Amino acid sequence: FEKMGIGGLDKEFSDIFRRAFASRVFPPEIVEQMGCKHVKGILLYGPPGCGKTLLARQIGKMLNAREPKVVNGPEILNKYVGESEANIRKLFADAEEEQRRLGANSGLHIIIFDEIDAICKQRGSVHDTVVNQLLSKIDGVEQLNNILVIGMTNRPDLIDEALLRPGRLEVKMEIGLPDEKGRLQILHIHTARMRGHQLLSADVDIKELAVETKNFSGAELEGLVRAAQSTAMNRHIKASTKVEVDMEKAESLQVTRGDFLASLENDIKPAFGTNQEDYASYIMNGIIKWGDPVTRVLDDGELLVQQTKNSDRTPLVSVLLEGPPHSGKTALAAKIAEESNFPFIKICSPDKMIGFSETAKCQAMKKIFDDAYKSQLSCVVVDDIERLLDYVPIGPRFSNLVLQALLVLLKKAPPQGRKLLIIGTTSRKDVLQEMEMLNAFSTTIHVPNIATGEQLLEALELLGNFKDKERTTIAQQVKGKKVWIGIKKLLMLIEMSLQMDPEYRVRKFLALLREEGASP
Amino acid sequence: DWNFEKMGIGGLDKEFSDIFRRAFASRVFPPEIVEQMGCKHVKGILLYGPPGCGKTLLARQIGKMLNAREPKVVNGPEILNKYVGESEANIRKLFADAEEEQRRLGANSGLHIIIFDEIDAICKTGVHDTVVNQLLSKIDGVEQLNNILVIGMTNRPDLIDEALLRPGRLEVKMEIGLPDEKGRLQILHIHTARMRGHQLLSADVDIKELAVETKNFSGAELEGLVRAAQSTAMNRHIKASTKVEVDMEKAESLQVTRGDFLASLENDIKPAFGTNQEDYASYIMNGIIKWGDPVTRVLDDGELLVQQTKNSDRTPLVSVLLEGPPHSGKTALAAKIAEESNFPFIKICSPDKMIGFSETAKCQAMKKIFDDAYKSQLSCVVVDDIERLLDYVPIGPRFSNLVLQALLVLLKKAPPQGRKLLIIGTTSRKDVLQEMEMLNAFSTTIHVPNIATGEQLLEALELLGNFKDKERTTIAQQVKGKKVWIGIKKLLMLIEMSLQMDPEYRVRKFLALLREEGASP
Amino acid sequence: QEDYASYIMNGIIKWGDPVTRVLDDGELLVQQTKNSDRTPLVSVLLEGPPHSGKTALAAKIAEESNFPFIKICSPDKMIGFSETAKCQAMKKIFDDAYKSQLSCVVVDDIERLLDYVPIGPRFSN
Ligand SMILES: Nc1ncnc2c1ncn2[C@@H]1O[C@H](COP(=O)(O)OP(=O)(O)OP(=O)(O)O)[C@@H](O)[C@H]1O
Ligand SMILES: Nc1ncnc2c1ncn2[C@@H]1O[C@H](COP(=O)(O)OP(=O)(O)OP(=O)(O)O)[C@@H](O)[C@H]1O
Ligand SMILES: Nc1ncnc2c1ncn2[C@@H]1O[C@H](COP(=O)(O)OP(=O)(O)OP(=O)(O)O)[C@@H](O)[C@H]1O
Ligand SMILES: Nc1ncnc2c1ncn2[C@@H]1O[C@H](COP(=O)(O)OP(=O)(O)OP(=O)(O)O)[C@@H](O)[C@H]1O
Ligand SMILES: Nc1ncnc2c1ncn2[C@@H]1O[C@H](COP(=O)(O)OP(=O)(O)O)[C@@H](O)[C@H]1O
């Protein structure tokens, strides 16, 4: 990476050079005396968009190798019986034909294979013949000494065992997310062109931009720069169409300047970063304090967050919130997850799986947990543990496969020294206990309802929407009667009651409240 | 001109503004501005949309507008030839002028505009893929070009090959949306300017009335309607059709009467989609009669809840349930409430259209309906006979789980952004729904009562219209001093059945049938 | 070597006699299976109250056996599998122990493999 200039995988490339390229830098006479052979392939897996192609391009260029070739995943698979092995054989055919002309002078024809998962046969849950031909061409009755295979993937656990035996693809490597220095380096390579012509502004602080970004991948920063320049062009056009003063201010306005900040929070939506639209959808009207239970729940959540942050013996921590229906459990869980300031946070709600079968839901949950396993910190929030299972009181009836997928994923530990936090939300804890799911968790929390008349009056006053005389009359009417109302139901009832003529407003609200239940 | 209406087309103005912003903005600035830092010159445009929505005219008018050479237009897959290599030679022949201009005039080269009619035909086995690769190499190969513009038009956007959709080859994609009411007004105005010029049109035709009546029409459909009305008007002159032809030339005086247009549109053209009719007269038939107080209360409650969902802020989702005993007239009331709502998007999902579909098909259809409702700004959807939507049988009991789960999840999914919604459901087995734990999802419920008192029965019978004072008095002699329990639909069926006897036995048969149907809860 | 390190985390604590008794029984079983000739196949079942450390003891015994072939068949590697896939995987894992002079296969969490659930009951036949 000294010659490449691009930074981010210097240690990885040094290690890979040691692993394989050590044989390419040595007295050739001792190399001949070696009597050994060279490798036949390698593998590279990691998060998407981490520049797994630039690595191959630069490494191939470094050793003065022939032109590379790129093959995508869904480039071979076809429904026809005999139209899959054709491309696999064709790719090796060109190397085979030229082997005769040189024989011993043949140079390495470095190539790139992308998304090996497409042809791999490991879908136990793509045919089972393409990989046989691939392995045979890689090695068979005849051995080819002028080939090399470089692969790419994001699901390393789905590759077949036969494709990693010592005869072929006997090495592996991983590509990880960069840190602040990596983001600084990336921002120094996708923006130097603007600096060359003095388009950038001195006010743009690269360190501030790097600090603001948390888990941006390689493509995210380039996209942010592109959007920032687009916004600068839009501002320039707005100024031009607004008023004409100089006719040379266009060049000065072409400067990106401080639009990077706006582009950060408006033009880029990282997949591994925090999401604001989920908060907007779930915590809609905002948290309004009306009692001590909210404070108790928040304190417990903060304590659990601290415990998971500062633990070494227990990398896995799981909590569970429960309460009566319409008590507002989702919002509190969303708030707790948000206020953790973790890098990775996702919500696996069931509203995104309308009409799916059991297998699709299992795959979705597995994918979400696999993504969570990557970052150095994670906080997954399972929304409804009673709608994923498809539970109906009649019967009873439910799905066993999802139950198992959940029961096994609440005890697995991350790899090496990574962390994780699993939050849950339910309303029928009794059936969960009946199903033996109540012991897999580590702690339980409660969320009570508005139960006291004074609490209801205080909550209504905080919400306002009623005048002094009306509120006093309401307080007079409630007296010592029983109160068992829900927050969501409370808001809905208030809104419905406030929809008629001003003369009859308290009357209808009181009638609806009384008609409702008054006991657990 | 930038009016976008000086041409012979209209309806899509915002898209015209967007294409003007994104296409010709760079060219307007002098070359000094471009040379300062350069720009991504665009040489790719694709157009699509509902079939026959005026896509072809946009390309022609855009080509005529720009001050450049005449664009080349190819009518579909005319490139293919019997021999080998002819297709590649033909496709190469198109770019010769561009290469010559790039070589000679360099940067200061006149723009080249290329029209591809039915690009989907050629781009989507050896010949076809070779031609596709040749096009891909020519458009973006070793030597770049910046004096070419290629525009393709299709009606199947999902068939265009992925390799051709990458940036740098097809950068601007346009969808031709349905014309609005103002677009329809403009279409009608420009489709009859000739007659007004010669003032041969009858004053009985109100263009605004046609615009209001017409809904979900393409421009070609409007033109066909106009021509069908023209033919209907012309028929009035010709007289002989079975014998040798003879025409009433002397009559002349050609006029376009409203009756001709109405008759033509009645049985000549019908829109492919957007036909929300034939159900507002099918589900609600025989009208709504005021046989007692309850109907007024139900209608008032429906109107109040509709108003609530109209102008609320923190309640973007409202649901109602109309329960009651069978044959009580539930579907008719729901249809009437929906009609009186008067919303942009309305649709009724009923099982009559899913006779034989399995669980997955029902789930997919419901999801499609609800997504369509999601799209528009605000809408009200209704569902009828839930117990039939999820096949239910008392024995066992037996039912389906996929449909129940899909329905349960879809009554609490907030609509995108600030849009609104309204859901109304119907059923007659409230107990089962409550036991399934679905009644807690619905927000409020209403009751639809039966005909209980004899006075109500007499009022309904008089309002419907039948029997007479003497027969009515005889009926009241026995029915007034008692209690009754019957539904309106059953009452209509019984009246119709008993009306088929002899004059002196109708009343006795009706009373016997009423005694047969007598019961109570 | 990674399996033993992963399944055993905080080592073994000698907090009583039962640990020694269990380890002695395991050693006796290992000796019997290595020496005898009329009983080439042996089996043993470990059970107890939940959260008592059974898998750890099984792994420790297996590592102390000093056999040439050792393997562990856990369920967490089979998330989302169907019944046929599980049967094929288990058969493959077992069929690799017939091609060596000695073997020791550990099957753990049987109740999870069979897909048990108190309601019903339900499981894979
Ligand atoms: N102090 C509060 N605690 C909880 N929720 C509150 C509070 N103040 C306001 N809310 C509102 O409560 C709503 C959260 O309830 P939510 O819609 O998530 O119900 P829920 O508990 O998931 O119920 P169910 O799953 O039965 O529908 C949010 O709209 C939030 O605005
Ligand atoms: N939205 C519209 N506004 C105005 N006129 C329209 C519209 N849609 C269609 N038309 C009319 O349609 C007629 C021709 O339509 P169109 O351009 O689709 O024809 P075409 O070339 O046969 O189409 P296609 O390529 O889809 O087969 C023109 O008279 C045009 O006035
Ligand atoms: N005020 C009214 N309300 C309802 N129906 C009325 C009224 N006046 C007359 N009718 C007649 O009663 C009919 C009721 O039939 P409808 O199919 O709507 O009942 P329904 O309860 O849906 O039947 P089912 O539930 O068994 O399908 C109306 O279609 C109409 O013919
Ligand atoms: N003497 C011991 N016997 C057993 N486990 C011990 C002993 N000393 C320490 N441990 C700890 O026991 C833990 C292993 O117990 P583990 O939770 O796997 O038990 P289990 O019975 O297999 O559980 P599960 O029922 O959840 O499958 C390891 O962390 C190890 O540190
Ligand atoms: N470590 C890195 N340093 C500089 N640029 C990077 C890096 N990783 C990714 N990029 C940028 O991301 C863009 C696309 O990366 P790509 O090769 O698609 O990643 P992947 O191999 O994961 O698909 C490239 O143009 C490259 O400039």
Curated annotation (Swiss-Prot), chain B:
Keyword rRNA-binding: no
Subcellular location: Cytoplasm
PTM comment, free text: Phosphorylation at Ser-350 interferes with homohexamerization.
Binding of ATP, residues: N286, G287, I288, I289, K290, W291, P326, H327, S328, G329, K330, T331, A332, L333
Note describing how the cofactor binds: Binds 1 Mg(2+) ion per subunit.
Binding site for Mg(2+): T331
Positions carrying Phosphotyrosine: Y48
GO cellular component: cytosol; Golgi stack; midbody; plasma membrane
Residue list for modification Phosphoserine: S350
Catalytic activity: ATP + H2O = ADP + phosphate + H(+)
A GO MF term: identical protein binding
Keyword Transmembrane: no
Coiled-coil regions listed in the entry: none
The entry's keywords: Acetylation, ATP-binding, Cytoplasm, Hydrolase, Magnesium, Metal-binding, Nucleotide-binding, Phosphoprotein, Protein transport, Repeat, Transport
E.C. number(s) listed in UniProt: 3.6.4.6
Cofactor annotation: Mg(2+)
Record GO biological process: Golgi to plasma membrane protein transport; intra-Golgi vesicle-mediated transport; intracellular protein transport; positive regulation of protein catabolic process; positive regulation of receptor recycling; potassium ion transport; SNARE complex disassembly
Role played: Required for vesicle-mediated transport. Catalyzes the fusion of transport vesicles within the Golgi cisternae. Is also required for transport from the endoplasmic reticulum to the Golgi stack. Seems to function as a fusion protein required for the delivery of cargo proteins to all compartments of the Golgi stack independent of vesicle origin. Interaction with AMPAR subunit GRIA2 leads to influence GRIA2 membrane cycling.
Entry's family note: Belongs to the AAA ATPase family.
Oligomer status and interactors: Homohexamer. Interacts with GABARAP and GABARAPL2. Interacts with GRIA2. Interacts with PLK2, leading to disrupt the interaction with GRIA2. Interacts with MUSK; may regulate MUSK endocytosis and activity. Interacts with CDK16.
Stated name of the protein: Vesicle-fusing ATPase
Part of the intact protein present: 212 to 740 of 744
